[PDB]
Design a protein around this ligand. Structure first.
Ligand code: NI
Ligand code: NI
Lengths: 392, 400
């Protein structure tokens, strides 16, 4: 593979780390990563990303054990770590409700979307360097493009959900990452999005497994799920999902999940995680890609995938789509819209002096609204709440 | 004897003495206060008392059908109503936690106890009359003597432990005049037997045995439904605790019906759960009869009590123990009581630091008058005992 994938956008003797170990190091020290401790028993988006990173390195170890052909093509541990630790930095306060509020406010100025924001943070907003954000290696950035097209190409929540892609205001740093690809590879990547790099496919499965399994254990202990509804929703569907392992073991997994002892539940959760993780292989992507990082993706075996989708659907139906969580997101989306409306009413007067200055400079190219959106996107829930109390 | 219709003290008012007692209790400030003591749950001591009253009248109806011999002796509807409406009047803020605090703070002045407080409210404190409280008829008062002895008949030393300061049960010595009046038409032999101990009193009147059964049935069953929907008990815990014990309790109806009763209670539909509750209540009511008391009492209101059939008693005791294990003896409830008992003890120590200066003016005046007999502490105790939780919280904030 080309050494141009190890390059950074901008340029000690004792530091002999790989480029991906330096990327992992920057992501860990960043303010964008540390704030995931605020954004949501102590399960946070930070905790979720750590769990995803552990599943992601487990996926790689398991692939390079059964498919030695790819041992050199697979991402190193610190690269797959970096994509899982950074994947969620772009999420705003109040999650999906916050995303909707911002996207509506920015409807006439490029929109808002969490994956777009993540790319925007690592290429510009995180102040590790003056002009290139965290200035990550090119392959790391390519791994973060879950949707490698621009959004120009791609109180009711359904209408305002954002499309997925990269902001047009970040096209320069998108051009830089895709630069060492032949034209034909580049033309396909924006095809509809349908495609993504090998490293990013591994990260997506790790996020999917973490979402499916690690939210589940604390939902059982908190009583948000009863034994009866687990049987009616998840356990019955897993008996008919078509994967033999889940069909065989679901009954005993359910008795372990309701054991009432953590050291027994841990065995169920680990066995599910291990079963999904050991069910992934690298196959060639069905497109005439030339670059090996785009010609191969990691895929979960289809039947195991049905089991994973039963698990994600169950977590969304009994942990996220319950009125108590959805009312909190409604409140957050009203709160964000209040903040956006007050701040844009008189920005140079209400923004903090550092952000007010970036607003005046950004208004020379009429990009002031994006400066306000970045600022709100970078708030924690508590910061956004005190600002609301200050203004109102 | 018509002496049971007499009071201590209009043309068109043709109500019975017991109908007038019921109306007074319904109108009293003491009764209205039971309403104070994200869901839509509003079960209070007031609702508990309405449900007891309705079970009480149902018990009387079953006895007057199965035992006509006793139709002259059984209480009228409004008498059994009156005893269930009033039974919880004396409870202090914070339930048992308040009771422990007041009793400890009155350790040298007669103690505090809720049943004693109930007697004190209806015979003196509730200002319906100037000198005799609600001025209820003698038989109504007798029905309220769940423990017809003085606390002198029924010390701990040494942060506070609940076991060490739970009050004995009885009547305050400062209310002896009103107790002497209630027991006056009894022969001496009945009177010295009534205060007999099992200290714990052993005996009570027929009207009061009925109220006790209705109260126990209300406590057993009507707490049970909302415990289920609030998630305070799961199906599994119901099976291990209540349902298994009821399958071995010895009463044939419960052993036969428990499986179907458990599926109805966890149906998730109010219109199905109420039929389980109604059947449990009805199975318990229809198992009560009047039998003679095992003591040579001469007065008919003391010679007979109502008793529940023993195997049925086991079923009721399973239900009462179950609500105590999953609705009351949980840390969430017990911490609220600990806080309340710390709160009550603070108010008492501040108010007794200087009562004239800190009490409301009307209570301050009662405190000055009571000091001619050196009973000032009981005035502070009545005042705290009649507060709601919200009033106590507000008074505490003004002081701390
Ligand atoms: Ni994620
Ligand atoms: Ni009661």
């Amino acid at each position: 593979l080309n050494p141009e994938w190890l390059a950074r956008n901008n340029d000690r003797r004792n530091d002999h780390r790989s480029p991906f170990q330096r990327d992992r190091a920057r992501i860990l020290h960043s303010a964008a990563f540390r704030r995931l401790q605020a954004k949501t028993f102590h399960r946070t988006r930070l905790t979720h990303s750590l769990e995803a990173a552990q599943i992601g390195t487990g996926i790689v170890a398991q692939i390079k054990l059964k498919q030695p052909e790819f041992r050199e093509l697979l991402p190193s541990d610190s690269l797959i770590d970096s994509l899982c630790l950074a994947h969620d930095i772009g999420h705003p306060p109040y999650g999906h409700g916050g995303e909707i509020a911002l996207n509506y406010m920015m409807r006439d100025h490029g929109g808002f979307e969490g994956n777009a924001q993540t790319f925007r943070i690592v290429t510009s907003l995180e102040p590790y360097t003056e002009h290139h954000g965290m200035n990550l290696s090119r392959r790391t950035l390519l791994g973060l493009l879950k949707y490698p097209a621009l959004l120009s190409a791609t109180l009711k929540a359904k209408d305002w959900s954002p499309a997925k892609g990269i902001y047009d205001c970040d096209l320069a740093s998108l051009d830089w990452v895709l630069e060492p690809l032949c034209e034909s590879d580049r033309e396909l990547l924006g095809q509809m999005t349908r495609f993504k790099s090998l490293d990013c496919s591994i990260m997506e499965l790790a996020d999917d497994i973490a979402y499916g399994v690690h939210d589940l254990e604390d939902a059982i202990v908190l009583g948000m799920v009863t034994r009866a509804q687990w049987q009616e929703a998840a356990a019955a569907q897993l008996a008919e999902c078509g994967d033999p392992w889940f069909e065989e073991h679901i009954a005993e997994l359910s008795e372990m999940l309701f054991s009432g002892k953590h050291y027994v539940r841990k065995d169920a959760i680990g066995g599910i995680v291990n079963a999904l993780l050991t069910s992934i292989s690298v196959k060639p992507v069905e497109a005439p890609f030339h670059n090996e990082l785009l010609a191969f993706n990691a895929y979960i075996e289809p039947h195991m995938g049905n089991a994973l989708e039963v698990l994600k659907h169950f977590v969304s139906q009994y942990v996220i789509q319950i009125p108590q969580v959805q009312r909190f997101e409604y409140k957050g989306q009203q709160l964000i819209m209040d903040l956006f409306e007050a701040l844009s009413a008189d920005p140079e007067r209400l923004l903090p002096q550092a952000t007010g200055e970036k607003w005046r400079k950004a208004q020379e190219q009429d990009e002031g609204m994006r400066v306000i959106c970045d600022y709100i996107a970078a708030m924690t829930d508590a910061y956004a709440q005190r600002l609301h109390q200050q203004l109102f």
